[PDB]
Amino acid sequence: ADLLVKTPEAYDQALKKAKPGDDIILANGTWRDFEVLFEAKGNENKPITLRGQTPGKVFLTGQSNLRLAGEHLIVSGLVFKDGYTPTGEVIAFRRNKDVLASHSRVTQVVIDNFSNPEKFEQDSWVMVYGRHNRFDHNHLVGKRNKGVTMAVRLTTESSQQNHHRIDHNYFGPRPILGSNGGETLRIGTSHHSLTDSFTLVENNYFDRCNGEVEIISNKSGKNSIRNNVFFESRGTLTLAHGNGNIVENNVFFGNGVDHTGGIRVINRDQIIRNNYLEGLTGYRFGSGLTVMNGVPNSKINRYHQVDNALIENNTLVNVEHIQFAAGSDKERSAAPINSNMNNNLIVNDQGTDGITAFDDISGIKFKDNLLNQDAKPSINKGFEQADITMQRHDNGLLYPEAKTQQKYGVSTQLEPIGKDEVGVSWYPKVEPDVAFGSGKHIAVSPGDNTLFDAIASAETGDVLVLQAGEYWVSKILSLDKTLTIRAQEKGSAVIFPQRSTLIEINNKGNLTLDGVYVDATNAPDAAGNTLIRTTRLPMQRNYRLAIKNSTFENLDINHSYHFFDAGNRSFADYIEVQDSQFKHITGDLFRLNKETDDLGIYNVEYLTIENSNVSDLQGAIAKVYRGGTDESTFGPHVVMNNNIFNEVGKGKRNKSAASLILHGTQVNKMTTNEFNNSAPIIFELTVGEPKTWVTGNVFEGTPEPVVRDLFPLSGATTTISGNTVL
Amino acid sequence: ADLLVKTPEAYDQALKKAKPGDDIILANGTWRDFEVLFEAKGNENKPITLRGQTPGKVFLTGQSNLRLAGEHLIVSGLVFKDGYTPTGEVIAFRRNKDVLASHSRVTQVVIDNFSNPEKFEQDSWVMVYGRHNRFDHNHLVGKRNKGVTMAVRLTTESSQQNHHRIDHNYFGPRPILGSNGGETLRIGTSHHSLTDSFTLVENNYFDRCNGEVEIISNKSGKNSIRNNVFFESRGTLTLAHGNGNIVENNVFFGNGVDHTGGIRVINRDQIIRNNYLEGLTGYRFGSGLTVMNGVPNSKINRYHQVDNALIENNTLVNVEHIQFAAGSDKERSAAPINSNMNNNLIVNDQGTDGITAFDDISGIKFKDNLLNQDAKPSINKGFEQADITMQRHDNGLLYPEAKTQQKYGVSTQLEPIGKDEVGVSWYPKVEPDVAFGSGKHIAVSPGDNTLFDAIASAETGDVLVLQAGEYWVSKILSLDKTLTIRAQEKGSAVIFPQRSTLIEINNKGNLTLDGVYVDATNAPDAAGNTLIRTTRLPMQRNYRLAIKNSTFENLDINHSYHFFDAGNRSFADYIEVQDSQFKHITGDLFRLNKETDDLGIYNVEYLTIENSNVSDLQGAIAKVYRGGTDESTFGPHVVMNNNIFNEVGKGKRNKSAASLILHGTQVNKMTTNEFNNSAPIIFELTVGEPKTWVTGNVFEGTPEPVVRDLFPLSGATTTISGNTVL
Ligand SMILES: O=C(O)[C@H]1O[C@@H](O[C@H]2[C@H](O)[C@H](O)[C@H](O[C@H]3[C@H](O)[C@H](O)[C@H](O[C@H]4[C@H](O)[C@H](O)[C@H](O)O[C@@H]4C(=O)O)O[C@@H]3C(=O)O)O[C@@H]2C(=O)O)[C@@H](O)[C@@H](O)[C@@H]1O
Ligand SMILES: [Ca+2]
Numbered sequence A, B: 001a002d003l004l005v006k007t008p009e010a011y012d013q014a015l016k017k018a019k020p021g022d023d024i025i026l027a028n029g030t031w032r033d034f035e036v037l038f039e040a041k042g043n044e045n046k047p048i049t050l051r052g053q054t055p056g057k058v059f060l061t062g063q064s065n066l067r068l069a070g071e072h073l074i075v076s077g078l079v080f081k082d083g084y085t086p087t088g089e090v091i092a093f094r095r096n097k098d099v100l101a102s103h104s105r106v107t108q109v110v111i112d113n114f115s116n117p118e119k120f121e122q123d124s125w126v127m128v129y130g131r132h133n134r135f136d137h138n139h140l141v142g143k144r145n146k147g148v149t150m151a152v153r154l155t156t157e158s159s160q161q162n163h164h165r166i167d168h169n170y171f172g173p174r175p176i177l178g179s180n181g182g183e184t185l186r187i188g189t190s191h192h193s194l195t196d197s198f199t200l201v202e203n204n205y206f207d208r209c210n211g212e213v214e215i216i217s218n219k220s221g222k223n224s225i226r227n228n229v230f231f232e233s234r235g236t237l238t239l240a241h242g243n244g245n246i247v248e249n250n251v252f253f254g255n256g257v258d259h260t261g262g263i264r265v266i267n268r269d270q271i272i273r274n275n276y277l278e279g280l281t282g283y284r285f286g287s288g289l290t291v292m293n294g295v296p297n298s299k300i301n302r303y304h305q306v307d308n309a310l311i312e313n314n315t316l317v318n319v320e321h322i323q324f325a326a327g328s329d330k331e332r333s334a335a336p337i338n339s340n341m342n343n344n345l346i347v348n349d350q351g352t353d354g355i356t357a358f359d360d361i362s363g364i365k366f367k368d369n370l371l372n373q374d375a376k377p378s379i380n381k382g383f384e385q386a387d388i389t390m391q392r393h394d395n396g397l398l399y400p401e402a403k404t405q406q407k408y409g410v411s412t413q414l415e416p417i418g419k420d421e422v423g424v425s426w427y428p429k430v431e432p433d434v435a436f437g438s439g440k441h442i443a444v445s446p447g448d449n450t451l452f453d454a455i456a457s458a459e460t461g462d463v464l465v466l467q468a469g470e471y472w473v474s475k476i477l478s479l480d481k482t483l484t485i486r487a488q489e490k491g492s493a494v495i496f497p498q499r500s501t502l503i504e505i506n507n508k509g510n511l512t513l514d515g516v517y518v519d520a521t522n523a524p525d526a527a528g529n530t531l532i533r534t535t536r537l538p539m540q541r542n543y544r545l546a547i548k549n550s551t552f553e554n555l556d557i558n559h560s561y562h563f564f565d566a567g568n569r570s571f572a573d574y575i576e577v578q579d580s581q582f583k584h585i586t587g588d589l590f591r592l593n594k595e596t597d598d599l600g601i602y603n604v605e606y607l608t609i610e611n612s613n614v615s616d617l618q619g620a621i622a623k624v625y626r627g628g629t630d631e632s633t634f635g636p637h638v639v640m641n642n643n644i645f646n647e648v649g650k651g652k653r654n655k656s657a658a659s660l661i662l663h664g665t666q667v668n669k670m671t672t673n674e675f676n677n678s679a680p681i682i683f684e685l686t687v688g689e690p691k692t693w694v695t696g697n698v699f700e701g702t703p704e705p706v707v708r709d710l711f712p713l714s715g716a717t718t719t720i721s722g723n724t725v726l
């Protein structure tokens, strides 16, 4: 029977009287603050269903969540948006610890940016318990807070040996968390990694899941992770804990996107076969292929020795790093044993074969692995060279044209599931970011508050074009959308801030300045001014900041007039300065050092300053800080080239005494710069083997770069060469 | 004529056509975001009035304010609430720097928690300019942000020599700022303090004005502060800058409340006569009567030598500190000069007369002063003892029973104005705090998010009574009201947190935990958990936290699991732990060290731990920090008696290497504790002559107390005695 319900109370009555075979039907509409406890007992061939009347037209908003409990249940056709769960998870396969759900299915459900507003209160979106449950054809996108998106729980035997099936799901874009805990899928936990889960994870599409280094974190036994697609995703499929796992038929399209892994092998009896990997640029534990060194003999929470890994019939095209025995050190002294790497195909366009060994690899028997002539080998036995021409098939995968060479690599029958073959047809897969300049151009004339008004009425992605004239700003400009402020004629538009802040970046705000000139002479004669800042509230979305062809002068009417000040727990997807000029500033340029509690949280992923001129700056050019020992993130990157810095950072209120102080930054590149009469660069290198290059610069009147290694000598590759000190 | 208006447009029209003698009447209701400019020109006896239709029914909310410009204006019957001023003031006697108001009157206006939500965005509530203005029968309560509540500016000679008159106002409870800049009334500034103001401040009631050390800051010449009543106010009447002032017929009822001043005499030609001071406990610069030493040569922003002070006919009853030549040091080297103290009456029942002289006091002649028999004299010439019996007259003041003795101290004619003779009779004077356990008792049972719902439905002041069982908590317990959580049988209610936060203290939230048992084993496996914390957003209300008979165990599933985490710019009125046990915690216990910018800002007024047990805490018992050189506040106060600390503070991530680290705390008492096998106590003494007592403790297996003095040698009194160091 069909049981249409239009109020929660009516839902409560229908649940009390549903029978095996009935459908409880939630009427089309918006159900705000609806905590669904769907607790019932269907039969094997007569389930009890909870469905939205029209998939796409039932929305659960506000503090809404779902919990299944009982057996033989089905939930379908709901959308969770505009809100966030009041509990630890949006969808849970249990009432609580006392009543689990088994033999139940959740299908065609959408969770779209149902993100907790506090970026670091932790939750998950899907939490699976019990046994023989299915989570299929669902759509999850835009999780911006701490916490893995979907987890299989194993906390009781009831939930173990579960044979859960997780298939045909759209695991859509997850922005960078800027901390640890941004996994998309976790199966089990270190404390239960020795139990057998038997989870099948098949035919899912992972579309730019960029939350952290582990996309999938396997932490239990005998799971099968097969036939998935990982598209431009920053991270890896990591067999972190647990033995006896099968990783087959997966496809990785990194497209050369920065920091794409990766199958990471740890522990024992893992089977890695018939996987196709292409365009992966990740390195170290994010490499395209990684066989770890273990710790012997601990201790569930530590990585154990790789033992009886079988690694066969994989294809690796333009994979920049294949790492054997990676992580080797005093704790990770257990090199691989009893393994086999057979019939793989490695093709690499830039000379090398990407392989690097960090310990004895005699524990891996290599046999019948093909690589291309130009690809210089790193291992003698097990790898031969040949002339390959790779040609793309109708399935989208590359293969040797020689039919002899097709006993190497993946089978020609691999059909990677398509992005349009997962999720729900009735909910659109969209781009997560508004592109700059994607809207309309809007002419703005000078005056009083004309910049304020043009912003309030612009639509997201528009471009404000400033005619010639002066622009006085006596109201703080708040940015809650993607906006470019361009000058019609470069340098002909002059903005005069009149308040302690000129531009506050808010949730959904992203800013490009292009050709503007800022004279801060008329700012409030007070200390602490911040020309540009994020909202001082905790944010929920990352933000983008580009500054091109712009000039910013006279931030000096009182002390500590900062150019950019990031708020606590804020995160810039990138901050980029280009062909811009700065003169006379009494405070710091970029304050990205706010996360002082040393948990691995940082404020920016890519800071880039190129072709720009900074003169008379009392504070630092950048204070960037990522404290602690976490190795789950990839940033910050700091890249600064072709700039001229004069009289920078000598100020007395600059306690760093540096013109750049980078603590915990993981990629540094300072090339072809001028550091005239300034304070020195200071690095404080931490965990994770950070890579630093400072080559080709002038240090006239500025001391030499200073390297403080707080974790020596743990792999930190620093190359400070090619500079001339005067 | 009466011009009733119902909209701002209709208000503008009524103002254009109004003439001397008319009344612009704002219609009853709520006027949101109404920035009122009331500029007009009345006549000496035909004023132009702006007034609410019914006093008590016209509300200006949101971003509203009031400016007065012209002459012979009157504003009356308005209530500012539910918002804050979008400029520098809520009420201002000027349009701007060049159009002021004179001969104008603000009367019967209420400002009630119209506080800017960001504690350290500074505004004032009332700003007077011009001449011959009046501010009377008003009601100001609940200003929670930096900035004097009301000031009289002398920016120009147009605003000097004003004879302004400020009378019959209720200056109601102002909470402890936790910082400099929480004065109630300021009359001038330092730079203008040599101009005469002739402002009269009379018949006002200051009720728990606890913003900072200065209740009133006089910084002008020839003002007259008389017939005011200061009730349980934690501050002083300070003659900061400016000469020729008279302080007379004032009444101070301290009621023995902590940190009650005080008339502080600085500068020249000050008359202090016929004031009644009783039950004042303040000391150093917040003493009941303070005669400062000055700076001799001799700028304006500098306290100048006391010269020709007249201090006569005052009555001081249980005034614990009367400090002569206070502040004497190398810069403040000019002792009082040409002054006189006559016919005062000191009656103290604590063995002493409370007098301390810190320098040569021959520049003060004493004549005909009386003291009770039991008080040990500190001066003999000009003082004479007698048998004194004090009876309380019907004006509420104590007078000698002997007629012979009535020529010392205050006149019997004084009539101190009551609390019910100020403000408006149509707006209530309520209590600023809800008392714990003032509400009703609500029984609670376990366990399906049972505690969360009991909190949702409770009313402020209520007492939840947890029946025996387990309370599994999957939602954050957010408190926006005063509330007690009691176990019906101590230790029989067990609370299992399952989130990174269990309890969030929000605005208006205040918590007592009595007899609860918390086991946190099931918290999320992630670093940085906090069992209890303030909101991470900006907090407007101070909070109170009391923890009794309660046990908190197993906060150790991952590193840095703190028990209490204070949020930036938050402030605890007190934190009180009594008879409680804590076990196995990897983070700190009380993180009260968040204000690292060294501006005088702190996080707690009283931290007290007593009769309690902590074992296996890797972080500190407390990290409480107040940096800089500000001397405007009174705390923190840290008191720890009769505890047993075991295996505390030795954790690798405790950068303090301390078990207790107090920087800038002003009163410290560690007595009869056991510090077994722990990191040491570490004091970092700052300014303010702080007082420290470490007596009777066993430091077994723990280094002795470290004491660092950032400012030796100041008056820092430190008494480390009677401890056993094994
Ligand atoms: O001389 C010494 O021994 C002692 O001097 C004491 O310092 C006093 C000064 O008398 C100052 O008054 C000061 O009060 C300041 C406020 O702190 C604040 O700076 C305020 O700011 C004004 C600003 O000056 C300007 O006029 C602007 O237009 O308005 C601002 C505003 O509304 O805040 O100005 C006050 C003023 O000038 O008095 O600090 C203290 C004071 O008593 O509060 C004493 O603090 C002691 O430490 C010295 O040893
Ligand atoms: Ca992690």
Ligand SMILES: [Ca+2]
Pocket: B180, B181, B182, B183, B212, B214, B632
């Ligand atoms: Ca002050």
